[PDB]
């Protein structure tokens, strides 16, 4: 549709990009949100562990990495909070999902349950658990 | 060469998912069961919020109070002898 505020470009519409983005955990519609959130949190915590231990205030002392690891965990907690409130102000208890109903081709498909109170709650819980697990794994691998 | 249909408005207004996928879950059933059973207590929202707030506050307070002077220069305190003021004030 030429009258929609979007353009078709090789980057935005390519088989490789489409496949890679559709295989990301944030776009798997059929899977329940908990398993996606667990993976997202694991990856985010494992990434976040590094910079705190590499550029922290105590980075030159012997405690450094341990302290940095703790800081990373704290950040995850804050992020989890930033998720929870976002659910409370967005999705009500009884309203259905607000995800798009039809695909690009035009076929009718089941809307994602991530945009729901229970779905978002599961996503946040999985994200918190995965973030804590990833931070712990990164610390153990780096300093053992 | 038409772009406006009154019968349905999802196509007319452009309500699509560009990168959505409806494939079945690739995760192993055993790992999925383990994660589902172990991550259950954090599913509730109000309980999660209250637990996060209380645990963060308690942990931060405990770490701040229990910390020694090696990590924190403020807890170590001054070491050099004091100095006098401009007009001899103490």
């Amino acid at each position: 549709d030429p009258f929609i505020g979007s353009l078709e470009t090789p980057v935005t519409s390519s088989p490789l990009i489409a496949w890679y983005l559709s295989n990301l955990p944030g776009y798997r519609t059929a899977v329940n949100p908990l398993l996606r959130g667990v993976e997202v949190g694991l990856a985010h915590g494992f990434f976040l562990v590094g910079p705190f231990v590499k550029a922290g205030p105590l980075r030159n002392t012997a405690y450094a990495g341990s302290a940095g690891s703790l800081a990373a965990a704290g950040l995850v907690v804050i992020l989890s909070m930033c998720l929870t409130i976002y659910g409370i102000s967005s999705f009500k208890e009884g309203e259905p999902s607000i995800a798009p109903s039809l695909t690009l081709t035009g076929r009718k498909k089941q809307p994602d349950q991530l945009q729901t109170a229970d779905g978002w709650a599961k996503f946040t819980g999985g994200f918190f658990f995965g973030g804590i697990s990833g931070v712990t794994w990164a610390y153990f691998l780096l300093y053992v | 060469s038409v772009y406006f249909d009154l019968e349905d408005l999802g196509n007319t207004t452009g309500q699509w998912d560009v990168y959505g996928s409806d494939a079945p879950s690739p995760y192993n059933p055993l790992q999925s069961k383990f994660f589902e059973t172990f991550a259950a207590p954090f599913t509730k929202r109000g309980l999660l919020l209250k637990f996060l707030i209380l645990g963060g506050g308690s942990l931060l307070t405990y770490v701040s109070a229990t910390s020694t002077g090696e990590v924190l220069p403020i807890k170590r305190g001054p070491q050099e002898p004091p100095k006098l003021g401009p007009r001899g004030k103490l």
């Binding site: 409130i85 102000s89 | 910390s67």
Partner: peptide, 30 residues
Amino acid sequence: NNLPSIFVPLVGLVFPAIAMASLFLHIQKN
């Protein structure tokens, strides 16, 4: 003693977060 080491982090960090969360939730409520 050591009251400042317990009270400064509380007022500086925890209370602003609690107040911000409460105010955001109250504002966004319909």
